[PDB]
Amino acid sequence: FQFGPSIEQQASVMLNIMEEYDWYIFSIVTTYFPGYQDFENKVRSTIENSFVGWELEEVIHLDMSLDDIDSKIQNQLKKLQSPVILLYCTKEEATYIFEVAHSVGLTGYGFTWIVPSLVAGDTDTVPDEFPTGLISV
Amino acid sequence: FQFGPSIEQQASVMLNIMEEYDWYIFSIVTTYFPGYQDFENKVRSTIENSFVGWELEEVIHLDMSLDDIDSKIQNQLKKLQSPVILLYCTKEEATYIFEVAHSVGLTGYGFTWIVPSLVAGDTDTVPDEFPTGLISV
């Protein structure tokens, strides 16, 4: 036994948090890191069941492996216009994605980011590469 | 006397070219370089007079001076969704704007760029920073 949790539950909490602030419109940026499209699947069921017309804008899958000269992550991430972003990746990857988001301008006001447990981790050490106002469980 | 031309005429040719391919919807990215908003003015008259409902989406004025850490040019340029872009600037500036566009993803297929005489210049030397399919007079 552990004093811990899972991925589906966390996704649920992310949804509850979004519902609480009534942020209906959101996108998911994910990486090939484990649990993807099971995250998408859990969200698909949780979002789908509800009567409400919330919108999923984009789902993005980018491999941290085959690291980029192209800034392919920048090239995808720059596209998305949505106010509320769910991110899923390894903590370090989160650092890189956030640097890229800072370049893209996705971190700035009115857009907001929401994270599952893994990125915040211990929470003892926080590279300020993470934007402020970052919301996580 | 010179075997040459002006700015208004070039803008007219750009319009004729766009009309020929029937690209109705377009935006203008410009810089503080000389002739701006006279370019806008000439276009305003030329576009305005015609019965047709073509659309000007955005006009952007960015100073090459006060060169950017912010990638403010990236920050503006990324926004525009229009298929047909008229650009106006110094040749070198065109190099920088194009690198920025390549980062933004504006150079890619279905979007097309159209240029007045100045950027192509001699045409003897062409940094491949310019995207292919670039259309100019």
The method recorded for this entry reads: cryo-EM
Query: Contact A1/A58 with Cβ under 8 angstroms?
Result: no
Which residues on A lie below 8 Å from B104 (Cβ)?
78
CB of A44 within 8 Å of any CB in chain B? no
A129/A29 Cα distance (integer angstroms): 17
A94/A30 Cα distance (integer angstroms): 10
* Cβ contact, residue pair B105, A79, below 8 Å: yes
Computed on alpha carbons and rounded to an integer, the radius of gyration of chain A in Å comes to 14
Axis crossing angle, helix B39-49 with helix B8-20, rounded to the nearest 10: 40
A118/A88 Cα distance (integer angstroms): 8
Q: Among A118, A81, A83, A86, which residue's Cα sits nearest to residue A17?
A: A86
Query: Contact B107/B98 with Cβ under 8 angstroms?
Result: yes
Resolution value (Å, 1 decimal): 9.2
